[PDB]
């Protein structure tokens, strides 16, 4: 797409976007622009014409779009970034939200299987990992992150069991033996479980802290997600 | 026999015995896999097909590693015999081409299992110097299918059992192979090789615009 | 214009022109490219099994939900009700 | 509570299955179709090509770095299947002992590194079980006898033919590979199977003038027996003659599930045929293989009622269902 | 030859009395002496337990190892590596039988001089020290275990940056509470008790004897690290293998008249050449002869 | 004989059991619940992994195509929410088999399936239902069914079935068929008729065994 | 990695500069000090023991059969293995590829000083034990295999073998050795580190390596095995067709003087 003058609008790996620096007149006054890659792009350096060339160059096959992280005008600092199963350009990270199955529950902390990473929804992405195409890995949802009205006494079996399916976001990577997640925001918690500590009917949540069971006729408390 | 697998009767023995080149690209045309990539070239002397399979980015946790790393697994072809060594030097080759190709460094503790599977090659008529174009052009697909970071395209000639591959329109060469080819090649080889690689570079782009 | 310019201009040409825009003869003895499009069950390379259009009834009941439950993800009584428990609780951290 | 909202977005099948496959399955068949979208009684179409990888492709190629006996190339779904059959060579009714087995390898490929894998080897051994108790091959097939070959002196060698001391049999091997399995695959398997051997040829044999009397000279730091006759016996492909086989224990398999519905659980014994689907292979717990041949003879039927209500109702609907798959893969590819 | 050394045999795999250096034999039965390390005993009769010489070491007449591993002790100020980054402490390799520990209360840190870091995250300790890196650090207490507490706690103290690594037997250099110093060309060694020796131009820390405080643990290396620079560092640390090779001890004076002395050669490769590193060593032992030490 | 069964024989073990049939003989034991594997943890279920070990020479492929048979079946014998991210491993022993290995498994199966009931039920792990399994033969000499077959009835077979059955409701109330593993050929008719014989033949069966755990069971606990 | 990202910079800066001054400060024509050490076994057909500046051994060890040649495509079988790694890691095996194909009949090696008449030829048993490795083996493999194949005494045939002699076995004289001359191929690794080729990388000088091209040198020239080799996975950079025409010419220069002073102990 088209974000200036000399933007491609189809971009393939080793195809450069845009000059590392460039220039033009918005009344009557240069603009001094200063290009650098984000996600899906690499500033690739280059020698052409008996000088070094840096540039700006696509890694991922795909839609050329613009943003933002803001001579006699302002230098104006405009992010690029192509955007194009789908594990394989998103890894568990910050910001990426992730579904997550609760591997084994502890005293100040949980280990939830990730099973699938969403798009940074209205885009998702299911991971390759399965325990049916083998290999696993894990994340901790803890004791402190589980609420954030009240969340200093509110354990984790207060509010979870093993076996439960819950969405959370990866909140940083962490140490590189977890991901480190949180539950805390109202979108996040629990997307279903199964009444009876798992073992029941199919339970879906009827309050934020409440899933009711079809089948025993009682409510099994839990952390909820919303939409 | 074995605990593993079954292996029949082990006092057995196996039987006695008595642009030059198309190559059309497919992709994305199996799935349980995150990009697949098909090549068949065909050729006067031999025709062949290669599928390649690339499974993850895959997350290695309980270890920080600086960066990300790539795994190659040849597979015997079903209609080929090799010995295993060479399919580890093929692999530790292309290994080395593809550690200067991907960029590893959005991806923190990262392995990728790439699969090449040499399946069919035929003769109508070494072996494995002319099956190199064939496997960089594959799996160079599949990881852009994928949507793993590339620094440009990697592909490659052969010229003479001699195999150069080149990224950046033939400027930079990522990998350099001569077996059992003649004392100063080096020129006829370098050029006849550059047309090649340019030529299925734009082969590959297309691949991916139907798409 | 600039010299910045004009390099960026014949790269970028070179670049383009590399890949040029071949039709692909097939000549394909395989069969991959009719596996790639398995389509519906009226399609190529696939069995019949019901006379109607499959996918489109299934699509169609995608269709039905989506924009209701994606706009009303806070318009319900039982969220609005729940949000003002939460923007209470919310209002001494803030201040 | 009465208002409602509190369930989550609407997620994707794919991710929906990842979440949780009993739900997801449910879901799907509340419309009457499976989770691949697909009505309940249809399945995976089968196409196969033959003699595209087999040595004996062509006639006017023999080559010798090919051995390949019978082969086939299956591809159901995405899920392909390719088959090869090879040969060794080895010396010397009703009963089950009369048939023979081919020791199959079969390999699958889901993401994993090894080749080694407990699915994997679970499907070989019982796949060279189906072919014994199918009773497809009788040993006599496999044993031959050798002509001789005699080099003359006249710069010509006679290779002598006896129509087709001591006696051989072969022993029948299949590589199969496996890419990109998402669901049950033995089926699969089976079907390629026996595409590829009614496609197998065998090599001939051959024997040297006293070949009882010839000499082996190869162990050697013996401590005696290190000089001894031996039999030995090269094959050549210049002829080969075709398999001989038992057409009528050719079956061609299916796949079932027997799974039940509830209204509340996705909030009677309900029949699929076939899985293809991550969901349908996770929970689809009941579950009947049949392998049936195509005059109305069945060579094994494995019921594995994974906990879910049975009646044999479902089983009586499988079994015809089974054979005119049967009849329909029979007559599409006329083998 | 010119281009390459190749010291030439063939035909062969390869080419008196001490103090008790083997147990199992009769060392003492006096029950007042041998009573700590190197020794055990049924009774009071001690019969050796490593190989070494006996001499007085503190209050007791004990068996001393002829060589072995680095043994910390406090005072002591390394040179050495990061082998592990945890959620409290980094294990450290100096050399020696077990890592020691570098922990939170016991570093400065790049940013203030303890800043830039507010929670305890492995992820924090992660960014400032890597696997690998090199820093000097001093000896804060010796435990028992083998373990040694570390600290890095001046402004001096911290990263290693600039230079080249080298390295020796911990044995074959002045054992000293610090031999940290100038030396000429204006290039500084920072040489521990441990045998790693790093040496870099001389920056604003040592320069400063004759600092930082943002760049405690933080990558940097300058730009303005020059030619003549550079081959004054290969120089250097050649004509310490010099010494090494020659098994003596190093000070700071061998290795300014082993530099001097090399300069007869004109070209730095020639200098790590067998028949040269014999000539230097042989060169510095008579300056000490000729001077009376 | 017929058949046999014996429990608590073993003493180390959470629970054992030798069963023995005729000329087959299998002892078991239960181990666990026990703490889990790493590989082997699972979320709310009890984790299985069976190991089937051959009297002669050494187990092989074989021995997984019956673990998974034996598996199957197990699943839903115990009570899988019983135990949460715990281990049992039941290890199977075949003392004799008596017959052909590779050949013929209708009777090694039909054992091992009784013996793992047992074992468990010496164990305490709960059990939903019982379950026992019959071989079940068909000979070519006179075209017809043989129940119960000996060594050299099997030897003369054209075919073999066995069948495993969820006993409820005073276990005599067939619940479910949790294994119907028919090889040879069979048509229809036969097949109805294996059910049938069938659903009699295992009621006595389970007779059995429930009288003998009763009998066993009864000195020891006491009040 | 096992250095430190300062360290790698300094390293970086120093060998891409003009000099190219490094820890040992050798200009790009010169080799560390090597130590051969030979002939250790009375069992064995030749034996070489060889130790390097950073403290890498390799042992390499010769033995042999005399084997009927129309049976066999191969002479010599090249059995690498390395202390501390197992029998099928991938740098294992891909170093017996490596060194299988150095030493490949009619390429660049004698097929005709291992044979003793037109039927039988000595299929010559390479076995190659690495005591300590921390750095790559494959070049000092290739000197010590030099050392060696030139230490190598066979048997010397009792009698003028005919191929219709009488039509059995060879048979050695009881004593009485043949010395073993044939030439092997000598590998030399060079290394690029911007625009500068050097030969000979150190250990440390291998962890900053964009890339390395492996070539030998057999009988006055080079020739195939040609390999490129990336020797880290970290600062891989690409390359020139300009630099590798330079590290050609500097092969052809500097190889001769090297195999002369090794082949005369």
Same mark, same amino acid.
Not at chain 2, 101 to 117: A, C, E, Q
Not at chain 3, 54 to 61: L, P
């Given at each position: 797409?088209?974000? /200036? ?19 033009? /007149? ?7 622009? /200063? ?41 104006? /600092? ?150 | 026999?074995?605990?593993?697998? *079954? ?86 080759? *292309? ?28 003769? *109508? ?24 970071? *590339? ?61 | ?95 | ?57 062509? +006639? ?265 798959? +049967? ?9 | !030859? ?138 804060? !207490? ?123 050669? !004109? ?11 014999? !000539? ?14 | ?15 054992? %059991?030798?069963?023995? %049939? ?6 078991? %034991? ?128 054209? %075919? ?64 | ?26 200009? =790009?024509?010169?080799?560390? =000090? ?40 191969? #002479? ?22 490596? #060194?299988?194909?150095? #030493? ?96 000979? =990388? ?59 002073? #090794?082949?005369?102990?």
């Amino acid at each position: 797409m088209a974000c /200036n003058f000399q933007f491609p609008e189809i971009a393939y790996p080793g195809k450069l976007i845009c000059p590392q620096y460039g220039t033009e /007149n918005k009344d009557g006054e240069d603009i001094i622009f /200063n290009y650098v890659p984000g996600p899906g792009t690499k500033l690739i350096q280059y020698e052409h014409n008996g000088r070094t060339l840096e540039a700006i160059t696509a890694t991922l096959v795909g839609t050329v779009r613009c943003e933002e992280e803001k001579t006699r005008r302002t230098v104006k /600092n405009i992010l690029v970034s192509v955007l194009p199963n789908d594990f394989a350009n998103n890894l568990p990270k910050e910001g990426d939200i992730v579904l997550t199955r609760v591997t084994r529950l502890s005293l100040q902390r949980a280990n939830v299987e990730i099973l699938a990473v969403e798009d940074k929804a209205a885009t998702f992405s299911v991971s390759q990992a399965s325990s049916d195409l083998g290999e696993t890995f894990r994340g901790i949802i803890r004791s402190q992150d589980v609420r954030s009205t009240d969340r200093d006494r509110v354990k984790v079996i207060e509010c979870f069991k093993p076996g439960d399916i819950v969405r959370a976001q990866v909140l940083s990577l962490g140490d590189g033996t977890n991901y480190y997640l949180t539950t805390a925001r109202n979108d996040l918690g629990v997307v279903f479980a199964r009444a009876a500590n798992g073992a029941g009917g199919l339970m879906y949540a009827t309050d934020w802290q409440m899933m009711t069971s079809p089948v025993t006729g009682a409510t099994e408390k839990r952390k909820c997600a919303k939409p | 026999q074995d605990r593993r697998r *079954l292996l029949g009767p082990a006092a057995a023995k196996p039987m006695a015995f008595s642009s030059e080149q198309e190559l059309s690209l497919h992709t994305g045309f199996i799935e349980n896999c995150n990009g697949s990539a098909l090549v068949e070239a065909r050729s006067l002397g031999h025709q062949t097909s290669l599928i390649s399979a690339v499974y993850g980015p895959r997350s290695i946790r309980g270890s920080f590693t600086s960066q990300g790393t790539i795994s190659i697994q040849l597979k015997n072809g079903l209609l080929e015999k090799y010995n295993t060594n060479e399919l580890k030097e093929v692999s530790s080759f *292309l290994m080395g081409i593809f550690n200067s190709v991907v960029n590893l460094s959005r991806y923190p503790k990262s392995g990728i299992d790439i699969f090449v599977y040499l399946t069919y090659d035929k003769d *109508l008529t070494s072996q494995i110097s002319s099956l190199i174009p064939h496997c960089i052009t594959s799996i160079t697909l599949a990881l852009a299918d994928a949507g793993i970071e *590339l620094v440009d395209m990697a592909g490659a000639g052969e010229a003479n059992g001699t195999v150069v591959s080149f990224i950046k329109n033939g400027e930079e060469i990522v990998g350099f192979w001569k077996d059992d080819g003649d004392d100063e090649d080096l020129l006829e080889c370098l050029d006849r090789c550059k047309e090649q690689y340019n030529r299925y570079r734009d082969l590959m782009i297309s691949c991916l615009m139907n798409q | 214009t600039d010299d910045f310019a004009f390099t960026n201009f014949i790269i970028k040409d070179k670049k383009n022109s590399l890949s040029t825009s071949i039709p692909l003869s097939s000549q394909n003895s395989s069969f991959l490219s009719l596996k790639k499009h398995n389509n519906e069950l009226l399609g190529i390379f696939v069995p019949c099994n019901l006379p109607k259009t499959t996918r489109k009834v299934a699509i169609e009941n995608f269709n039905r939900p989506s924009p209701d439950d994606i706009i009303q993800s806070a318009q319900l009584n039982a969220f609005n009700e729940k949000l003002e428990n939460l923007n209470i609780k919310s209002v001494p951290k803030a201040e | 509570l009465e208002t409602i909202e509190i369930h989550p977005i609407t997620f994707p099948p794919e991710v929906l299955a990842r979440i949780s496959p009993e739900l997801s399955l449910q879901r799907h068949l509340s419309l009457g179709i499976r989770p691949c979208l697909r009505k309940y009684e249809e399945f995976r179409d089968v196409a196969i090509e033959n003699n595209t990888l087999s040595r004996y492709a062509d +006639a006017g190629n023999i080559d010798t770095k090919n051995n390949i006996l019978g082969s086939n190339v299956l591809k159901s779904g995405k899920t392909i299947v390719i088959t090869s059959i090879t040969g060794g060579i080895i010396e010397e009714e009703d009963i089950i002992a009369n048939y023979a087995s081919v020791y199959p390898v079969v390999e699958v490929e889901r993401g994993r590194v090894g080749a080694c894998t407990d699915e994997e080897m679970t499907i070989s051994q019982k796949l060279h079980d189906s072919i014994l108790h199918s009773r497809i091959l009788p040993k006599k097939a496999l044993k031959v006898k050798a002509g001789v070959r005699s080099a003359n002196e006249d710069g010509t060698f006679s290779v002598l033919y006896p129509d087709e001391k001591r006696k051989w049999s072969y022993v029948l091997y299949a590589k199969i590979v496996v890419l990109s399995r998402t669901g049950p695959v033995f089926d699969l398997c089976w079907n390629s199977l026996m595409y590829a051997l009614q496609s197998v040829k065998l090599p001939r044999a051959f024997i040297d003038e006293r070949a009882s009397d010839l000499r082996m000279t190869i162990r050697t730091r013996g401590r005696s027996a290190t000089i001894r006759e031996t039999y030995e016996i090269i094959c050549d492909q210049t002829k080969s003659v075709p398999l001989m086989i038992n057409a009528k224990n050719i079956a061609f398999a299916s796949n079932y599930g027997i799974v039940e519905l509830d209204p509340e659980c996705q909030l009677n014994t309900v029949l699929i045929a076939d899985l293809d689907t991550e969901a349908e292979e996770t929970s689809i717990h009941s579950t009947i293989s049949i392998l049936a041949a195509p005059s109305g003879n069945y060579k094994q039927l494995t019921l594995m009622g994974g906990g879910a209500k049975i009646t044999p109702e479902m089983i009586k609907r499988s079994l015809l269902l089974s054979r005119v798959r +049967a009849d329909d893969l029979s007559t599409r590819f006329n083998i | !030859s010119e281009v390459i050394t190749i010291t030439k045999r063939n035909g062969a795999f390869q080419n008196s009395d001490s103090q008790i250096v083997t147990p199992g034999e009769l060392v003492t039965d006096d029950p007042i002496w041998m009573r700590g390390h190197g020794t055990y005993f049924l009774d009071n009769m001690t019969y050796s337990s490593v190989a070494g010489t006996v001499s007085r070491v503190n209050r007791l007449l004990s068996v001393i190892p002829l060589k072995g591993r680095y043994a910390p002790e406090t005072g002591d100020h390394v040179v050495g590596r990061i082998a592990e980054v945890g959620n409290k402490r980094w294990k450290v390799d100096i050399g020696g039988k077990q890592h020691a520990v570098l922990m939170l209360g016991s570093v400065n840190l790049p940013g203030g001089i303890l800043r830039r870091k507010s929670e305890s995250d492995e992820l924090q300790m992660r960014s400032f020290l890597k696997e690998g890196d090199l820093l000097n650090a001093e000896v804060q !207490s010796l435990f028992q275990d083998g373990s040694a507490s570390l600290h890095t706690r001046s402004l001096k103290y911290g990263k290693l940056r600039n230079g080249m690594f080298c390295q020796v037997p911990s044995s074959l250099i002045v054992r000293a509470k610090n031999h940290t110093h100038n030396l000429p060309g204006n290039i500084t060694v920072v040489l521990g008790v441990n045998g790693y020796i790093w040496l870099r131009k001389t920056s604003q820390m040592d320069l400063a004897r004759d600092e930082s405080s943002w760049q405690i643990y933080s990558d940097e290396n300058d730009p303005s690290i020059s030619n003549n620079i550079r081959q004054a560092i290969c120089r250097y640390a050649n004509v310490i293998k010099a010494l090494a090779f020659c098994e003596i001890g190093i000070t700071q004076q061998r290795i300014v008249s082993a530099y001097e002395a090399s300069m007869v050669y !004109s070209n730095v490769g020639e200098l790590i050449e067998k028949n040269v590193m014999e !000539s230097i060593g042989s060169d510095i032992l008579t300056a000490e002869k000729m001077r009376g030490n | 004989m017929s058949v046999q069964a014996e429990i608590g024989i073993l003493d180390h073990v959470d629970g054992s %059991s030798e069963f023995v %049939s005729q000329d087959t003989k299998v002892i078991c %034991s239960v181990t666990g619940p026990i703490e889990p594997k790493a590989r082997q943890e699972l979320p709310t279920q009890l984790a299985l992994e069976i190991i089937v070990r051959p009297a002669k020479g050494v187990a092989t492929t074989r021995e997984k195509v019956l673990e998974d048979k034996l598996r199957a079946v197990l699943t839903p014998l115990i009570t899988r929410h019983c135990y949460p991210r715990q281990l049992c491993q039941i290890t199977c022993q075949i003392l004799e088999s008596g017959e052909d290995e590779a050949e013929f498994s209708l009777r090694e199966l039909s054992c091992c399936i009784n013996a793992a009931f047992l074992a468990l039920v010496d164990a305490g792990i709960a059990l939903n239902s019982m379950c026992a399994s019959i071989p079940i033969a068909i000979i070519k000499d006179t075209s017809d069914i043989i129940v119960d077959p000996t060594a050299e009835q099997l030897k003369i077979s054209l %075919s073999v079935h066995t069948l495993a059955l969820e006993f409820v409701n005073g276990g005599k109330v067939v619940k479910n068929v949790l294994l119907l593993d028919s090889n040879g050929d069979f048509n229809e008719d036969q097949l109805f008729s294996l059910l049938e014989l069938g659903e009699q033949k295992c009621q006595e069966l389970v007779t059995n065994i429930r009288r003998i755990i009763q009998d066993n069971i009864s000195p020891r606990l006491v009040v | 990695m096992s250095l430190s990202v300062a360290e790698k910079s300094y390293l970086y800066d120093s060998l891409a500069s003009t000099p190219s001054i490094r820890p040992d400060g050798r200009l =790009p024509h010169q080799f560390r =000090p090597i130590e051969i050490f030979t002939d250790f076994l009375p069992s064995s057909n030749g034996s070489s023991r060889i130790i390097a500046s950073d403290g890498s051994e390799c042992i390499v060890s010769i033995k042999s059969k005399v084997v009927d040649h129309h049976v066999e495509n191969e #002479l010599l079988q090249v059995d690498v293995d390395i202390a501390g790694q197992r029998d099928d890691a991938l740098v294992v095996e891909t170093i017996t590829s490596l #060194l299988n194909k150095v #030493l490949k009949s009619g390429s660049g090696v004698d097929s005709s000083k291992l044979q003793l008449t037109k039927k039988y030829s000595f299929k010559i048993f390479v076995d190659v034990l690495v005591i300590s490795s921390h750095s790559h083996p494959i070049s000092l493999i290739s000197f010590a295999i030099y050392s060696a194949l030139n230490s190598t005494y066979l048997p010397k045939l009792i009698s003028a073998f005919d191929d219709l002699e009488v039509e059995e076995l060879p048979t050695f004289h009881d004593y009485d050795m043949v010395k073993l001359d044939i030439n092997p191929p000598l590998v030399f690794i060079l290394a690029v580190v911007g625009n500068n080729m050097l030969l000979d =990388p150190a250990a440390n000088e291998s962890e900053v390596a964009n890339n390395g091209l492996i070539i030998s040198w057999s009988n006055g020239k080079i020739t195939s095995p040609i390999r490129s080799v990336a020797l880290n996975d970290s600062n891989v950079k690409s390359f020139k067709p300009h630099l590798l025409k330079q590290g050609l010419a500097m092969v052809e220069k500097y190889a001769p003087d090297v195999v002369r002073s #090794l082949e005369n102990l």
